[PDB]
Amino acid sequence: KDFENQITELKKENFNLKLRIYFLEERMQQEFH
Amino acid sequence: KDFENQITELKKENFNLKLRIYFLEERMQQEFH
Amino acid sequence: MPREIITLQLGQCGNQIGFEFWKQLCAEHGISPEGIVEEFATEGTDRKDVFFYQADDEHYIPRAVLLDLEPRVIHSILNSPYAKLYNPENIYLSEHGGGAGNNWASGFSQGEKIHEDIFDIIDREADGSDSLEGFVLCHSIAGGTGSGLGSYLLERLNDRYPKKLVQTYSVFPNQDEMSDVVVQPYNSLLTLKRLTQNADCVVVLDNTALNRIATDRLHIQNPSFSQINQLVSTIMSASTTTLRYPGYMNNDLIGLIASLIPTPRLHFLMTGYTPLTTDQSVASVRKTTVLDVMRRLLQPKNVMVSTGRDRQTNHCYIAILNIIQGEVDPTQVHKSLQRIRERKLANFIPWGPASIQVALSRKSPYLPSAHRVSGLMMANHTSISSLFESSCQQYDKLRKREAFLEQFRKEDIFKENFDELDRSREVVQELIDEYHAATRPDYI
Amino acid sequence: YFLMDQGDFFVHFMDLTEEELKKPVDDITPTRLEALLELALRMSTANTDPFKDDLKIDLMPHDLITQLLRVLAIETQQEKAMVHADPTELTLSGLEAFSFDYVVTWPLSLIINRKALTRYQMLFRHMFYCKHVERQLCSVWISNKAAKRFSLHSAKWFAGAFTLRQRMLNFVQNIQSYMMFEVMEPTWHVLEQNLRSASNIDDVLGHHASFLDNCLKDCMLTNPELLRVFSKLMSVCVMFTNCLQRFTQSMKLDS
């Protein structure tokens, strides 16, 4: 259960970081570009 | 060793994605200023 | 959006079922028998628009039309405490209190003769309901109005609202008990045919099963027609608890019908209640596990359907839906699904989609639940094919032996021959064969 | 708003506000959506919810899964292939774009960051998409009623539609049961307990971060390929229902 929890937490944090990066890239493309 | 391999990739991926967001956010806040 | 249901009560049994269901809905939504919302239900979570129609007095009035050809049931419904709860304009009472004479052909003739009055009440209820979803026909399969007028009402609801679900609370006759109407077999066959053709889904409420369950599980010695109507009202309040109290899953009749009827034609549902015990049977510090509830519901002592224990028909559930009223842990629901699947607490049909859903929903705040976990079981089982076969065989016995054939042939539906009863038995036999196929891998 | 428990508002949220959800990015008029939201807000017993004003209409500049697969299913091959894909010029309906965003004040509730607001908006848009899809499936299930008085053995199109709906409705009912049982029932109490345990800014942030991130991993929508697999599995049953309904529409107008 520890490895599954670690994988799930890693995936959630990866999704949050990916969402932040996606929002930043979309904002940069909409404003700078 | 698979648990450490998972941790190593989780850390590296999070550190790199957060570096990407670091560049995105710093290069956005200056455009918001 | 609210989804009102036009409750059409036909025959004495149907009128009792409709009146009891209206009383249970008023109690669960906290609407007083005068329709003036009870003081405790002003802030109630009951979707009163969803279940009851809001009259000019704001009375929580279910869109219920009580149409019976015998004045006894109509008078009893009008003499119930909930008279001001429902709208008077939707109750059509035939001054000719002669009934259909336990003949389904005569009942259909009565339904068609009062079709203007009854169809008027149905259309009035549909116009008085914001999003009237369909009609629920509570009637008796062995009665004349219940079987015959039930067929007529189901056909009329299907014709005026072909896109509206036609649910029937058909009181199936006692296949093991000698029906007092020798033509009651033909009436039962015609009611089954109405369920199969002019009704979108039929919940068979076998009075023999009602008496057996009340006596054995609820310890109710000799359940009366009043007792059967009260049990139907309690089961309806349990099924509409999630209707008044908005939940996350199975929020509409169409959704429940879809989850319980893999075959559009094979929507005949057997009934069960869990835990099946008298209110005096207080489960002593017994934390009813979701798996324990599933086992008790699967116990035949808890099923409210008189399905012949036919070893020839491999009874299996086409779809199983457990309506839980009370504080039920959703994680316990998932554990219940796992335990029931592992222990085979419920037998599923071999030729239907595997549907074991565990949904946590709240009960009506105005409806107090004595059991922390109360269970209503709507299962499509091939044992209903056994009950349908018993009903069809009784109908064949009546038609072939001309039992009460004077009463059957006296109506236009059987004026030339017992064609209405014969087609009814054929429809019942076809449904039974399809249900047995559904429990068999070859249905699809 | 975006956390269920408004069951009446949920039943009135997908029945009415999904009119122009299939319209273009800017084809749907938001005035009708706002009017419908207000009507469902105040035409029933849902007034107990005190933050319906906080439920603001939003629209991600991608689909709820278009942006997801553009970032979550990125950094392998799509971070430069379709990470920044613009949905406006492509087929991106209102339902695909719309979401709901939250912002909170500076002197009080200064923790609603634009990132947390966007995460909550994606969560709301995906939860209401699922609720609307469940409502649509329940509506499509009743299709075999116009010919319910007709034998289904000779209704190949309608009979096949019913036979496939036999499993499609189970696929929706069991899903809506299990997900609401596991996430919503657990997560509501979990968030309540974490908030009751928080005392400092750090503790409240930890409680909120749990309630957000753990739910972000409960849905299993954080993978680069499972999202695409879910999209393929979800765009097939709905397409089947639509094709069956189009074949069955001959009874509506062709008959």
For residue D62, give the nearest of D32, D34, D76, D82 by alpha carbon: D82
- Sequence-distant (6+) residues with CB within 8 A of D59 are D25, D94, D97, D98, D99
Would you say how long chain A is, in residues?
A: 33
Give dist(CA C428, CA C391) in Å, integer. Answer: 8
Size of interface C-D (CB pairs under 8 A): 171
Residues of B in contact with A33 (CB under 8 A): none
Give dist(CA D232, CA D151) in Å, integer. Answer: 34
Give dist(CA D20, CA C399) in Å, integer. Answer: 57
Three-state secondary structure string covering C179-196? CCCCCHHHHHHHHHHHHH
Token pair 């036909």 in the structure block, residue: C10
For residue C150, give the nearest of C206, C209, C66 by alpha carbon: C66
Q: How many helices (H) and strands (E) does chain C have?
A: 17, 11
Is the Cβ–Cβ distance between C5 and C133 less than 8 Å? yes
User: Which residues does residue C66 pair with via DSSP β-bridges, in sequence order?
Assistant: C9
Residues of C in contact with D3 (CB under 8 A): none
Residue type present at position C10 = L
Dihedral angle, C-alpha C143, C146, C149, C154, nearest 10 °:
-140
Token pair 């409705």 in the structure block, residue: D169
Give dist(CA C307, CA C210) in Å, integer. Answer: 11
φ/ψ of residue C375, rounded to 5:
-135, 130
Is the Cβ–Cβ distance between C154 and C198 less than 8 Å? yes
Token pair 């939250």 in the structure block, residue: D102
Give dist(CA C149, CA C109) in Å, integer. Answer: 7
Q: What is the separation, in whole angstroms, between the first and last Cα of chain D? A: 43
- What is the CB neighbour count within 10 angstroms for residue C124? 18
Half-sphere exposure of residue A14, counting CA atoms within 13 Å on the CB side? Answer: 24
Measure CB to CB from residue A21 to each of B20, B27, B31 and give the nearest one: B20
Mutation target for D interface from A26, A31, A32: give the one with most D CBs within 10 A.
A26
Give dist(CA C238, CA C304) in Å, integer. Answer: 14
φ/ψ of residue C374, rounded to 5:
-115, 145
Q: Which two tokens stand for residue D229?
A: 């697999």
φ/ψ of residue C138, rounded to 5:
-100, 115
* C83: helix, strand or coil: helix
Nearest chain D residue to C196 by CA distance is D149
Is the Cβ–Cβ distance between D149 and C163 less than 8 Å? no
Give dist(CA C217, CA C146) in Å, integer. Answer: 27
Residues of B in contact with A26 (CB under 8 A): none
Give dist(CA A18, CA D179) in Å, integer. Answer: 24
Q: Which two tokens stand for residue C11?
A: 């025959």
3-state helix, strand, coil in chain B (%, to 5): 95, 0, 5
Angle at C330 between CA D208 and CA C241, to 5 degrees: 115
Dihedral of alpha carbons D178, D179, D181, D182, sign: positive
B5, with CB counted inside 10 A (0-12, 13-18, 19+), is exposed
> Under an 8 A CB cutoff, do B21 and A25 touch?
no
Residue C119 DSSP class: H
For residue D189, give the nearest of C364, C330, C288 by alpha carbon: C330
Dihedral angle, C-alpha C91, C93, C99, C103, nearest 10 °:
-40
For residue C188, give the nearest of C41, C33, C21, C398 by alpha carbon: C398
Token pair 């765009």 in the structure block, residue: D235
Residues of A in contact with B17 (CB under 8 A): 14, 17-18, 21
D65, with CB counted inside 10 A (0-12, 13-18, 19+), is buried
Give dist(CA C187, CA C175) in Å, integer. Answer: 12
* D201: helix, strand or coil: helix
Please list, residue by residue across C303-326, b when 16 or more beta carbons sit within 10 angstroms of its beta carbon and e when fewer do: bbbbbbebeebbbbbbbbbbbbbb
Token pair 């979309």 in the structure block, residue: A26
Give dist(CA A22, CA B31) in Å, integer. Answer: 17
Which positions in chain D have a beta carbon within 8 angstroms of at least one beta carbon in chain A?
A: 61-62, 67-68, 70-72, 74-75, 83-84, 86, 114-115, 118-119, 122, 212-214, 216-218, 220-223
Q: C317-326 and C373-381 as β-strands: parallel, antiparallel, unpaired?
A: antiparallel
Give dist(CA C128, CA D46) in Å, integer. Answer: 22
Q: Does A3 touch chain B (CB under 8 A)?
A: yes
Dihedral of alpha carbons C204, C207, C208, C212, sign: positive
Give dist(CA C353, CA C33) in Å, integer. Answer: 42
Is the Cβ–Cβ distance between C358 and C329 less than 8 Å? no
Bond from prior residue into C275 cis (ω within 30 degrees of 0): yes
- What is the CB neighbour count within 10 angstroms for residue B31? 11
Is the Cβ–Cβ distance between C197 and C156 less than 8 Å? no
Q: Å from A4 to nearest chain D CA?
A: 11
* D110: helix, strand or coil: coil
Task: Please give the full DSSP string across C251-278, using - where no structure is assigned.
Answer: -SHHHHHHHH-SSSS---EEEEEES-S-
Interface of B with A in 12-31 (CB under 8 A): 13-14, 17-18, 20-21, 24-25, 27-28, 31
Give dist(CA C151, CA C362) in Å, integer. Answer: 34
Q: Which two tokens stand for residue C253?
A: 């009749």
| D39 Cα distance to chain centroid | 20
* C6: helix, strand or coil: strand
Give dist(CA C52, CA C67) in Å, integer. Answer: 18
Give dist(CA D59, CA D98) in Å, integer. Answer: 4
φ/ψ of residue C64, rounded to 5:
-110, 125
Q: Which helix (H) or strand (E) holds C233?
A: helix C225-239
Alpha-carbon Rg of chain D, whole angstroms?
A: 20
* D93: helix, strand or coil: coil
Q: What is the separation, in whole angstroms, between the first and last Cα of chain A? A: 45
C294, with CB counted inside 10 A (0-12, 13-18, 19+), is buried
Residue type present at position C413 = I
C175, with CB counted inside 10 A (0-12, 13-18, 19+), is buried
Is the Cβ–Cβ distance between C196 and C165 less than 8 Å? no
Alpha helices in D146-200 (DSSP H): 156-179, 185-197
Give dist(CA C355, CA C348) in Å, integer. Answer: 9
Give dist(CA C273, CA D17) in Å, integer. Answer: 38
Nearest chain D residue to C434 by CA distance is D153
Dihedral of alpha carbons D232, D233, D234, D236, sign: positive
